Design a protein around this ligand. Structure first.
Ligand SMILES: Cc1ccc(C(=O)Nc2ccc(CN3CCN(C)CC3)c(C(F)(F)F)c2)cc1Nc1nc(-c2cccnc2)nc2c1cnn2C
Length: 269
């Protein structure tokens, strides 16, 4: 499912990150901008299998809300995975740098796109395992594209996946609930300064993240149901996409806001 790109058509420019056994670059493809993940010499057999395997599944995906593979360099060294370049970068940093700049409808549209990509991934029989705003890319139309840059994300991970390594679409739904909270808070840290062990204890004791400020009641209800302890009680991604699409198409439904519990009280006359 992957197109082979000749190395002379690819120019690496700046390093933008690191991979398992290589760097990640911004570059140009003959010139459309691209992101480039390389596998550097001395890579192991396992690393090659993982690297080309990643390319293989990526080339299979054709969806508006999944990062698009442009091609691969497998016949030459260094080997490369080349994707579209998303100019606004990762969602979490994007929202932290643009705090309060979007409408409720725009934010819920982001979540609908993320949910649509996850519905596709799950129905293609893939589990993400690390769904978080840091793994979602934003383009110049505000379209969110599910991605995976590699890593322990305790705060995003469902209880059963932490406790006995059961990673499924349903534990991805838990993570999606956390991503909903990330988006509606413009990138706040889930559970703030609580330690990983304190987060697990609070969840086991039934506590859950409070409502964001200015959050539609419907949206908080949906993220709450993503965090049900009983995995079978969580919505499927099809349910999430359906609800988000109904709220967006009847946008007055988003004007009713969940109560925000103040953490500070200002007494003035
Ligand atoms: C080049 C490149 C290669 C690979 C990927 C990628 O998304 N891989 C991928 C692997 C697997 C899956 C599904 N599997 C998940 C795990 N499950 C167990 C099984 C299913 C998916 C899926 F489906 F979720 F989308 C995606 C992304 C890019 N491109 C970017 N990456 C970075 C970047 C920055 C810093 C550090 N690293 C990267 N910045 C970029 C771009 C583009 N623009 N910018 C600014």
């Amino acid at each position: 499912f992957t197109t082979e790109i000749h190395p002379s058509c690819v120019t690496r420019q700046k390093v933008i990150g690191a991979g398992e056994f290589g760097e990640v670059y911004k570059g140009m493809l003959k010139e459309v901008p691209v992101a480039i993940k390389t596998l550097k010499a001395g890579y192991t057999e396992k690393q090659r299998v993982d690297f080309l395997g990643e390319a293989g599944i990526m080339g299979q995906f054709s969806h508006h809300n999944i990062i698009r593979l442009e091609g691969v360099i497998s016949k030459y060294k260094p080997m490369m995975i080349i994707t579209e370049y998303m100019e606004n970068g990762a969602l979490d940093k994007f929202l932290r740098e643009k705090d309060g700049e979007f409408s409720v409808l725009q934010l819920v549209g982001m979540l609908r796109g993320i949910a649509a990509g996850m519905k596709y991934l799950a129905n293609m029989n893939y589990v993400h395992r690390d769904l978080a705003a840091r793994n979602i890319l934003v383009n110049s139309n505000l379209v969110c594209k599910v991605s995976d840059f590699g890593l322990i994300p305790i705060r995003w991970t469902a209880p059963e996946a932490i406790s006995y390594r059961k990673f499924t679409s349903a534990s991805d739904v838990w993570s999606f609930g956390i991503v909903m909270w990330e988006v509606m808070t413009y990138g706040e840290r889930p559970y703030w300064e609580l330690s990983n062990h304190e987060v697990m204890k609070a969840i086991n004791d039934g506590f859950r993240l409070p409502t964001p400020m200015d959050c539609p009641s419907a949206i908080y209800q949906l993220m709450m149901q993503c965090w049900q302890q009983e995995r079978a009680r969580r919505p499927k991604f099809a349910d999430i996409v359906s609800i988000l699409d109904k709220l967006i198409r009847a946008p007055d439904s988003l004007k009713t806001l969940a109560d925000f519990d103040p953490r500070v009280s200002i007494r003035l006359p």
